[PDB]
């Protein structure tokens, strides 16, 4: 029946909308993780280097 096909089309819209958000959110979550790791490792290493100089 076409009404149940229209329900399935609307369900497929909800999957791809939130899947596109889910892929973007994984990329953003990795971006924040790599930001934290890179900023932390760099700052603390250089901070210790200038502290040894001091």
């Amino acid at each position: 029946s076409d009404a149940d096909v229209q329900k399935q089309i609307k369900h497929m819209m909800a999957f791809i909308e939130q899947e596109a958000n889910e892929k973007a959110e994984e990329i953003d979550a990795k971006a924040e993780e790599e930001f934290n790791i890179e900023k932390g490792r760099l700052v603390q290493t250089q901070r210790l280097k200038i502290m040894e100089y001091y």
Binding site: V5, Q8, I9, H11, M12, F15, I16, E19
Partner: protein, 81 residues
């Protein structure tokens, strides 16, 4: 990513074919079908067969494998589009 397939099957297989698609892609397959303007001749036997076109829509390769397995189970043929 979005994904879809299109193909051809004998018209009498359609009720079992759509039911099996909704079993493997559980409760969720958008599809359509229509009878061809004439029956088509068999390359080996010369019999004329009342085939019908179909189109099937989904997301990702996991569903592509389920719809394709059922197409092969009913001896249907898929084509690139």
């Amino acid at each position: 990513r979005l994904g879809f397939v299109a193909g051809v099957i004998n018209r009498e297989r359609i009720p079992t074919f759509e039911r099996m698609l909704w079993r493997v892609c559980r409760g969720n397959v958008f599809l359509r079908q229509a009878e061809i303007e004439n029956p088509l001749e068999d390359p080996v036997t010369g019999d004329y067969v009342h085939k019908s076109v179909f189109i099937i829509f989904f997301q990702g390769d996991q569903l592509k494998n389920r719809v394709k397995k059922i197409c092969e189970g009913f001896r249907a043929s898929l084509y690139p589009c």
